[PDB]
RNA sequence: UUUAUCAUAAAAUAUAACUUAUAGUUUAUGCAUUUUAACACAGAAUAAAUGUUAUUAAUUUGAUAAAGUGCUGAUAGAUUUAUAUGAUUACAGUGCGUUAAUUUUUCGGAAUUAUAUAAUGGCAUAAUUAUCAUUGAUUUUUGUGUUUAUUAUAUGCACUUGUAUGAUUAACAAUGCGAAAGAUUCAGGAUACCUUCGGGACCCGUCUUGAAACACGGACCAAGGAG
RNA sequence: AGCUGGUUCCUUCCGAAGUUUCCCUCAGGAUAGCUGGUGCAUUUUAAUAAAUAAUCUUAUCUGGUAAAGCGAA
RNA sequence: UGUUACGUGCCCAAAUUAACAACUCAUGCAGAUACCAUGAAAGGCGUUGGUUGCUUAAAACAGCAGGACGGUGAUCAUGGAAGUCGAAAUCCGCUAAGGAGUGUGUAACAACUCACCUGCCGAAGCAACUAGCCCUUAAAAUGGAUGGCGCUUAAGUUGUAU
RNA sequence: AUGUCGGCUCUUCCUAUCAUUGUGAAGCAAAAUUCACCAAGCGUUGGAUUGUUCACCCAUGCAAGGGAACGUGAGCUGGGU
RNA sequence: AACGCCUCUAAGGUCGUAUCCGUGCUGGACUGCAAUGAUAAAUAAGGGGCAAUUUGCAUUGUAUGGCUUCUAAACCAUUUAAAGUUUAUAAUUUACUUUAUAAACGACAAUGGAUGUGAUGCCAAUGUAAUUUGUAACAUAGUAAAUUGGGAGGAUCUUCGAUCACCUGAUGCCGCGCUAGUUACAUAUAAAAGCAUUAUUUAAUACAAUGACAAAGCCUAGAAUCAAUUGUAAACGACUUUU
């Protein structure tokens, strides 16, 4: 046991298949191998059993009173501040990002690509003296070393 | 195969000279209101004669699972027909549903014995309270302090790319 | 290259099941996706080494008695075994099917220009995902050498040579990749033309 | 829950913009109280916009009845029946190469070394987002794994 | 049944450190260094930060369950091989015509001559780091000895298999080099 | 079932004094700390954790049935000789000349309410007739009273690119072009035949149960040639 | 020559039988049955039913198979 | 133009189902849709689910350790049998328990065995049945056929949903 | 009008393996043989008589296994039929 | 291990047939493919070749309304279903290898197109286009155009192995380009008649290949087969020898 994911009580699961879809949920009780009683009252999914093939299980484990009806789950969830940890969760911010990768009404798409070329110039333009490879050079100069000091300091120069 | 539970009642025909033929009922597992009646006569025939259409249906009514969120162990007692070989079973199923139990039953019976849905007869239904669960597989679920590893996963195919360049990636940590 | 989408998809034959890969590839060729399949010695087929060995031996028993040179070509190479699997799934007796076979290239042990190319995974074909735990499986290159593939020795040296060129390119690539990210990061905050587009994108890259 | 679906279904129509009704949240996400009413889909591939990158890779057939008057067209971005339903209505063109001219003045003047066959998209073939298409000519089937081209004219709102 | 948990424990002595990356467990004791790959089974190693290591099974039927105990006993054999060593002994039974076993250091093969006075010299491939020592005060006993339990007794078996006594009664020609004893080299006390 | 809530069993899941261990580490073979899907319903207690009885929540949840309630997309078709020797009729909108009142836009207008007649449902009452059983309901028929809603009639004439008129494709528009003879340009086509793609196509005549047959005649073609 | 082979344009519509009987019959006929055509008489089964034909049901008959029986012939 | 029967990895129109639960891993026709192009009788501590009966906390079940005798070669078969080629039979005693004996076999004696009860094991396991798939049975002849490729959490087999 | 049987000649395969290989059984001590397995890769013959396959004998060799394409008449022979 | 145990088996693992399959032996993919040589025709001629070329011009594909594209850098090295992708500190290495501590994407949702992962594109273009934009300033980040020599390296059916790199040194000076940001000044396209603009549905241009009329710019000067001939060869072609 390093720790792979447990179907445990309260190990949480973000159930893909459902009318729930993308809501964060907490495992109440372990039913049978195929199912778990799941209740996510702060993501507003009501109490239901659901199949472990419909839900795939999270990292997040909170000391849960396993067999809890909705009221005590809702009390234990806001005591955990579970929602807040789930917004920090950067892979859930990445899950909220595909709800935004949706459309971005095409106006916003060429923002990216117009202005990507601003950064794309600046890369090739920052490039080429470490140690590694070699690295160099003693030009051959009056523009070329004054173009290397045109990173650095940036006075007097060329040429 | 749609497992709905039905109360069916059937008297045996109606004469004014001849009073009030006795009223038998059954719980029947059927997808179908018609299958509810169909099985009902067949099982009624086994004790009490009563052929449809010297047979009076009566009322076909669907019964209401009392607790579908309810977390219960059921024992079902079962008769099946094998090729040369009709025999009896007790098996125990942990299900939401008496409906869900039977549906998981017809599948399980079908598998292991080659269990014909036509070759299977139900028998009896009871909800097992409390350590009467012979059930080695079942009694594993009853256990204080039920934490259990998630063993493995299930790889949606691929992706929303048919072309998954990001390699699944069996890892998961 | 130029395609409906990419005219060359270099596919990694590693940890692909042979018929699962062959069938999805056959569809792609009919669709006009023109694929190249590399490392067919790393190709796996399910069923124990021994079970495969006996299955494959059954065809060479098949031999056109009158002139066996009319008779069935028992293609030793893992690349050619892959090729037979795809060819059977395609109607190769039609002229449409001839076009589709020409769209397909099959190489054991990833040569020429394909090594600085990315070997794409087909995830349906993936053995690890589709195949059940604790099921023994065969590797096609092992099977190949039993039925008389000469070049098992040959490819293994050529693959090692290739891996070594592929190691030095990787090492420099990873070094270069560090220095590209710092050169974005350090100019980024220092005015705003990187703050404008990255945080107005703000998704998760 | 039939009622809850009805209440949930008011909300996306509200957002669209307008008729001005229901709000009853739905996520587009920060949201002050919603991861609620779900992460898209999705189901992709691309082009899209002169032309969906489209494949004529078949005719609508019986097992061995060729039935070419309607064709199967795979729209790249359409995995799903829902996505291909966007393309239901769109005009299609297959532009292809000829050695020999033919056609002189009516509209432009095409040097007809470039030929075009014009069609419309119809109903959703696929469990996996292939679509049926009728063309005014019909496509010769030498077009198979040839890229055919679907302009987003006729789009409904 | 698909029993969800079955655990075994392997008690590790104070002199030995066993370090598991993956399924390869490299143990370092007093006699030296044993590496074996449990890489085909896919079983779990947990250090409950003791010397004792627990090797476990989850969600694997009956066949998988049974293979967890092979590894527990296998790692116990590495632990017992690095402190105690494994030693196997073989008799050389001849009714008259002496099974002559020559060679050794170690770099042996194992040359068997004059069995059953057949001019044929059988030479049975010596497996790697198993050593054979011809036993002092015990007439024609050949001892096959190595840290790795499988290699040693398999090397001892090969020299058994040929002398196979062809065409003449194996029940009366008792003739053979048969493995008599499965034993340990060094420990416990003295 | 579930929410929300009450009592009892009762905390059999978890929380919770405290008791114990391995072990990183610490202190000096053992300890102390802490971590441990390694301990003990372990004490009182807590969340009624589960069960049971009660009460419920925008009353849930499942199922089924029902309303042209309102509405969008796409697909194919659209004989239209409507006087060959047969219909074009019906309705609706709009204007005309009854009024009032309230309201909305706040301009042009629009709606609802204020009549008589007939029908229908709903209330009460009465009779019949059939029926489930009579506590009470339901049915078919009829009459009567009250009030209310709904619907139809009392809404004619003129005009109308209004709806249909029972195969109702055209408003509207663009483009090619009939450009004298001459003749451009457009559309459309498995003529012969070539090409390119898919699919299908085994040899006819015949006797025969069945013929592509490893059944029989017929190399090929013309002309004579038999109910 | 009851046998074998062949029989010469098309389209439309309907459309078989290898069974019965007798025959030196049994490689064939006649004959009945099936087939078409030609029509005829009346349509409440017809031209702008209180008359049936034949299938259910019902009512009313028949039967020695399946099963059963042999401590019933 | 629309929709079905039969099917749906691809060949070959069509979900490698955006469903699901089992069963099966097949070295020489694993298996793969009625008719149908074959498979049994009989076996299996392979695997899988059933049924019934057990031992037992006064410590069991495997597995070691340990007794396995005496009244009495009780005795008949003597060809030789004290327990044991075979048998009429068959009860006491000592007892914690030991059959006038389950076998190994010396021709006999004898030496080994198991029942029976124990030391350890102190909580699991054992027997007889039922029937699925697989395996055995199940071997034939030009090279070769679920129609093919190929398929092993199936594209098989059973059942179930679109 | 689908060229009888044998024998001559010539083919390839199959096993249900007699020999040979590698093996497991044995009331196999040796020798020897019998049984069974993977296996048809490789042998399985020379004659007397019969038209004869079949059969019956003789001789050697560790061993003289059995079948399928009624094989094989524009290949023979035409001996039996 | 199942069956505390025990056992060749369940998992994993070893040896093992006149078998099988290679080595080997035999045909040699008719043209499947590689290597290499000469590469003509001879001058009153020109011919071919590098032509990958370069020009008028032509053909054809690309993108097809700049471009409404595209990509031979590129997520390992694996036993594999607890199997596993990594970072950093302390060691360790040729190897994301090896060791201990702490974490981490705990086959989740994520992720699977793009981080376009040497941060592409559709940018350059401050009017982004079936015209190209041209021309001014500010301050910050900051860009570079050319040539030659030498030393070592690479190539698995691959678009030029008498080819293409990398590094290091030297030479000078065309200053040819400048980009992004903010801001000035001016303007052609664009007003494509059309109110129905898709319909017969384009091409200036861009990139890649091919062409060749007369002409132009470089290089170089074969053989095969038949006749005759051998016998190692053979029906005849053919094979092998020949001048």
UniProtKB/Swiss-Prot annotation, chain A:
What processes in GO biological process is this protein linked to?
cytoplasmic translation; negative regulation of neuron apoptotic process; ribosomal large subunit biogenesis
- Cite the residue spans of the region called Disordered: 135-159
Q: What keywords tag this UniProt record?
A: Ribonucleoprotein, Ribosomal protein
Name of the featured protein: Large ribosomal subunit protein eL14
Q: Which CDD domains match?
A: eL14
Instruction: Supply the Pfam families for this chain.
Output: Ribosomal_L14e
Give the gene symbol: RpL14
Q: Could you say which protein family the record assigns here?
A: Belongs to the eukaryotic ribosomal protein eL14 family.
Recorded GO molecular functions are:
RNA binding; structural constituent of ribosome
Keyword check for Ribosomal protein: yes
Q: Which InterPro entries match?
A: Rib_uL2_dom2, Ribosomal_eL14, Ribosomal_eL14_dom, Translation_prot_SH3-like_sf
Q: Which residue windows does the record flag with biased composition (Basic and acidic residues)? A: 146-157
Keyword Ribosomal protein found: yes
UniProt GO cellular component terms:
cytosolic large ribosomal subunit; cytosolic ribosome
Report which superkingdom the organism of origin falls in. Eukaryota
From Swiss-Prot, chain B:
The keyword Ribonucleoprotein is assigned to this record: yes
Chain segments annotated as transmembrane: none
What do the Gene Ontology cellular component annotations say?
A: cytosolic large ribosomal subunit; cytosolic ribosome
Provide this UniProt record's keywords sorted from A to Z.
Ribonucleoprotein, Ribosomal protein
A Gene Ontology biological process annotation? cytoplasmic translation
User: What are this entry's molecular-function GO terms?
Assistant: structural constituent of ribosome
The record's section on InterPro entries has:
Ribosomal_eL20 (IPR028877), Ribosomal_eL20_dom (IPR023573), Ribosomal_eL20_eukaryotes (IPR021138)
Ribosomal protein as a keyword?
A: yes
Q: Which family does it belong to?
A: Belongs to the eukaryotic ribosomal protein eL20 family.
PANTHER family given in the database record: 60S RIBOSOMAL PROTEIN L18A
The protein's name in its UniProt record: Large ribosomal subunit protein eL20
Species = Drosophila melanogaster
Swiss-Prot record, chain C:
Which Gene Ontology cellular component terms are annotated?
A: cytosolic large ribosomal subunit; cytosolic ribosome; ribosome
- Coiled-coil spans are none
Q: Which Gene3D superfamilies match?
A: 6.10.250.3250, Ribosomal protein L13
GO molecular function per UniProt: mRNA binding; structural constituent of ribosome
- What GO terms describe the biological role, i.e. biological process, of this protein? cytoplasmic translation; negative regulation of translation
Q: Which UniProt keywords apply?
A: Ribonucleoprotein, Ribosomal protein
Superkingdom of the source species? Eukaryota
Instruction: Say which family it is in.
Output: Belongs to the universal ribosomal protein uL13 family.
- What is the protein name stated in its UniProt record? Large ribosomal subunit protein uL13
Q: Which organism is it from?
A: Drosophila melanogaster (Fruit fly)
From Swiss-Prot, chain E:
Q: Which GO terms describe its molecular function?
A: rRNA binding; structural constituent of ribosome
Looking at the keywords, is Chaperone present? Answer: no
| The UniProt record lists the keyword Cell inner membrane | no
The record ties this protein, via PANTHER family, to: 60S RIBOSOMAL PROTEIN L9, 60S/50S RIBOSOMAL PROTEIN L6/L9
Q: Which family does it belong to?
A: Belongs to the universal ribosomal protein uL6 family.
Know the name of this protein? Large ribosomal subunit protein uL6
Q: Which GO terms describe its biological process?
A: cytoplasmic translation
| Top-rank taxon | Eukaryota
Q: Which Gene3D superfamilies match?
A: Ribosomal protein L6, alpha-beta domain
Q: Which UniProt keywords apply?
A: Ribonucleoprotein, Ribosomal protein
Please give the Pfam families that the UniProt record associates with this protein.
Answer: Ribosomal_L6
Q: Which GO terms of the cellular component aspect does the record hold? A: cytosolic large ribosomal subunit; cytosolic ribosome
What gene name is given for the protein in this entry? RpL9
Q: Which PROSITE patterns match?
A: RIBOSOMAL_L6_2 (PS00700)
Cited InterPro entries: Ribosomal_uL6-like (IPR000702), Ribosomal_uL6-like_a/b-dom_sf (IPR036789), Ribosomal_uL6_a/b-dom (IPR020040), Ribosomal_uL6_CS2 (IPR002359)
């Amino acid at each position: 046991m390093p720790f792979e994911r447990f179907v445990q009580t309260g190990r949480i699961a973000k159930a893909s298949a459902g009318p729930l879809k993308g809501r964060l949920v907490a495992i109440v009780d372990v039913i049978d191998q195929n199912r778990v009683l799941v209740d996510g009252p702060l993501t507003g999914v009501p109490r239901q059993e659901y199949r472990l093939n419909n839900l795939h299980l999270t990292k997040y484990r909170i000391k849960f009173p396993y067999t809890a009806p909705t009221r005590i789950v809702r009390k234990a969830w806001t005591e955990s501040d579970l929602k807040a940890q789930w917004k920090v969760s950067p892979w859930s911010v990445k899950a909220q990002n595909i709800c935004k990768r949706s459309s971005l009404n095409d106006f916003d798409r060429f923002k990216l690509r117009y202005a990507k070329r601003q950064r794309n110039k600046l890369l090739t333009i920052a490039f080429n003296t470490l140690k590694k490879r070699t690295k160099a050079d003693g030009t051959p100069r009056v523009l070329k070393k004054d173009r290397r000091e045109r990173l650095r300091a940036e006075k007097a120069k060329g040429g | 195969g749609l497992l709905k539970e039905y109360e069916v009642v059937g008297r045996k025909l109606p004469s004014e000279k001849e009073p009030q033929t006795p009223l038998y009922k059954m719980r029947i597992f059927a997808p179908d209101n018609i299958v509810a009646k169909s099985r009902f006569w067949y099982f009624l025939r086994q004790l009490k004669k009563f052929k449809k259409t010297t047979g009076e249906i009566v009322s076909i009514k669907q019964v209401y699972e009392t607790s579908p969120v309810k977390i219960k162990n059921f024992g079902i007692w079962l008769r099946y027909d094998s090729r040369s070989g009709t025999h009896n079973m007790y098996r125990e199923y942990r299900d939401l549903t008496v409906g869900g139990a039977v549906t998981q039953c017809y599948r399980d019976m079908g598998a292991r014995h080659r269990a014909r849905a036509h070759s299977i007869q139900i028998i009896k239904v009871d909800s097992i309270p409390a350590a009467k669960t012979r059930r080695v597989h079942v009694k594993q679920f009853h256990d204080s302090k039920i934490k259990f590893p998630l063993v493995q996963r299930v790889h949606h195919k691929g992706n929303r790319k048919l072309f998954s360049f990001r390699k699944p990636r069996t890892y998961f940590q | 290259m130029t395609g409906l989408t990419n005219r060359t998809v270099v596919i990694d034959g590693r940890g692909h099941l042979l018929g699962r890969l062959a069938s999805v590839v056959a569809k792609y060729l009919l669709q006009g996706g023109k694929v190249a399949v590399v490392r067919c010695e790393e190709l796996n087929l399910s069923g124990h080494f021994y079970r495969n060995k006996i299955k494959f031996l059954a065809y060479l028993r098949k031999r056109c008695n009158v002139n066996p040179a009319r008779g069935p070509f028992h293609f030793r190479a893992p690349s050619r075994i892959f090729y037979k699997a795809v060819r059977g799934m395609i109607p190769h007796k039609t002229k449409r099917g001839q076009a589709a076979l020409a769209r397909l290239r099959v190489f054991d042990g990833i040569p020429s220009p394909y090594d600085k190319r990315r070997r794409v995974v087909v995830p349906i074909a993936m053995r690890v995902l589709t195949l059940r735990s604790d099921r023994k499986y065969c590797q096609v290159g092992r099977l190949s050498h039993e039925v008389g593939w000469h070049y098992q020795d040959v490819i293994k040296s050529l693959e090692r040579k290739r891996k070594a060129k592929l190691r030095v390119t990787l090492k420099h690539n990873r070094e270069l990749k560090k220095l590209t990210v710092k050169a974005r990061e350090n100019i980024a905050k220092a005015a705003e033309p990187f703050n404008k587009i990255i945080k107005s994108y703000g998704y998760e890259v | 829950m039939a009622d809850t679906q009805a209440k949930s279904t008011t909300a996306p129509k509200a957002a669209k913009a307008q008729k001005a009704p229901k709000a009853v949240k739905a996520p587009k996400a920060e949201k002050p109280a919603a991861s609620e009413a779900k992460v898209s889909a999705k189901k992709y591939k691309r082009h899209g916009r002169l032309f969906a990158k489209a494949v004529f890779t078949g005719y609508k057939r019986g097992l061995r009845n060729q039935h070419e008057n309607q064709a199967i067209l795979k729209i790249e971005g359409a995995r799903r029946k829902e996505h291909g339903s966007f393309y239901v209505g769109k005009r299609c063109v297959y532009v292809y190469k000829a050695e020999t001219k033919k056609c002189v003045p009516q509209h432009p003047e095409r040097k007809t070394r470039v030929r075009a066959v014009w069609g419309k998209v119809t109903r959703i073939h696929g469990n996996t987002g292939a679509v049926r298409a009728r063309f005014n000519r019909n496509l010769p089937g030498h077009a198979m794994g040839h890229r055919i081209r679907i302009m987003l004219y006729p789009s409904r709102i | 049944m698909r029993t969800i948990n079955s655990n075994q424990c392997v008690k590790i002595p104070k002199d030995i450190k066993a370090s598991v990356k993956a399924r390869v467990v490299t143990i370092t004791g007093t006699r030296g260094t044993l590496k074996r790959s449990f890489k085909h089974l896919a079983l779990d190693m947990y250090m409950p930060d003791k010397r004792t290591l627990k090797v476990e099974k989850w969600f694997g039927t009956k066949k998988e369950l049974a293979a967890v105990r092979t590894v527990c006993s296998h790692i116990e054999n590495m632990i017992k091989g690095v402190t105690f060593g494994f030693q196997y002994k073989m008799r050389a039974v001849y009714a008259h015509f002496p099974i002559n076993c020559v060679t050794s250091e170690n770099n042996t093969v194992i040359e068997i001559r004059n069995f059953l006075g057949e001019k044929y010299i059988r030479r049975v491939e010596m497996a790697p780091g198993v050593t054979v020592v011809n036993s002092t005060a015990q007439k024609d006993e050949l001892i096959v000895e190595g840290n790795d339990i499988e290699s040693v007794s398999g090397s001892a078996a090969l020299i058994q298999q040929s002398t196979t006594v062809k065409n003449k009664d194996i029940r009366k020609f008792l003739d053979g080099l048969y493995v008599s004893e499965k034993t340990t080299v060094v420990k416990l006390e003295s």
